[PDB]
Design a protein around this ligand. Structure first.
Ligand SMILES: CCO[C@H]1C[C@@H]2CC[C@@H](C)[C@@](O)(O2)C(=O)C(=O)N2CCCC[C@H]2C(=O)O[C@H]([C@H](C)C[C@@H]2CC[C@@H](O)[C@H](OC)C2)CC(=O)[C@H](C)/C=C(\C)[C@@H](O)[C@@H](OC)C(=O)[C@H](C)C[C@H](C)/C=C/C=C/C=C/1C
Lengths: 107, 94
């Protein structure tokens, strides 16, 4: 599935609802720590609407159980991410992904 | 048919990103995008096409260039640079 490990706690009550827009900062890396993408390198947050299949399942289920302010470590199985095909040239086949993602606010 | 450039690029980009990101279809991605870039090439004929062009014209032309570079290089990195610009214009059109 996806494992969620807390780095810094959120307020414990403000969670995202389906259809809400989640504003996050993320740094993504392969399980060996090789970074492939980071919103912090760009200084601008990432937005996506929850429960719309805009993002991979691991993000949908992982971020859903985070509360505002919380910085967590998402360990995502290839099943909840890019699968056997992966993403050609970027993410290899059958890759477990690790995202450092902080839920900044809900809109 | 008659279509606003605002609307044409919105649905066009949604389609292209579905095909590339969702279905791994880069050939199909080129199919939907090329017509929209061709329309821009003949140039604005209304006030609404003129204002759209003034706002988003440079970004779209630059994105087409990164697609063009991908074509020669094989560097998937060049396609992502195109989509960075496409995402940018999309989220302003919305
Ligand atoms: C600069 C290049 O940057 C890319 C993102 C890169 C690509 C490669 C990835 C290593 C990565 O580096 O992200 C990455 O770190 C990462 O894996 N992410 C991005 C951050 C959120 C988690 C995950 C992800 O789900 O990406 C996903 C993943 C790649 C594809 C998803 C996966 C779930 C599927 O359900 C869906 O099927 C279609 C496609 C990409 C996105 O988050 C973007 C925003 C969203 C989409 C493309 C689709 O939802 C699309 O649907 C038609 C839309 O509705 C969008 C809004 C329409 C507009 C026009 C498209 C804009 C394109 C934006 C593209 C970018 C910013």
């Amino acid at each position: 599935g996806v494992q969620v490990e807390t780095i810094s706690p959120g307020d414990g009550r403000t969670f995202p609802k389906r259809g809400q827009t989640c504003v996050v900062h993320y740094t993504g890396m392969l399980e060996d720590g090789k970074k492939f993408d980071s919103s912090r390198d760009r200084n601008k947050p990432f937005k996506f609407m929850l429960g719309k299949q805009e993002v991979i399942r691991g993000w949908e289920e992982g971020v859903a159980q985070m509360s505002v302010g919380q910085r967590a470590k998402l360990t995502i199985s290839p099943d909840y991410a890019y699968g056997a095909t992966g993403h050609p040239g970027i993410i290899p086949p059958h890759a477990t992904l690790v995202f450092d993602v902080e839920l900044l606010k809900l809109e | 048919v008659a279509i606003l450039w605002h609307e044409m690029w919105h649905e066009g980009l949604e389609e292209a990103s579905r095909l590339y990101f969702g279905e791994r279809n880069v050939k199909g991605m080129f199919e939907v995008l090329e017509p929209l870039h061709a329309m821009m090439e003949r140039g604005p004929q209304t006030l609404k096409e003129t204002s759209f062009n003034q706002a988003y014209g440079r970004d779209l032309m630059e994105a087409q260039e990164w697609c063009r570079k991908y074509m020669k290089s094989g560097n998937v990195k060049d396609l992502t640079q195109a989509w960075d610009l496409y995402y940018h214009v999309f989220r302003r059109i919305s």
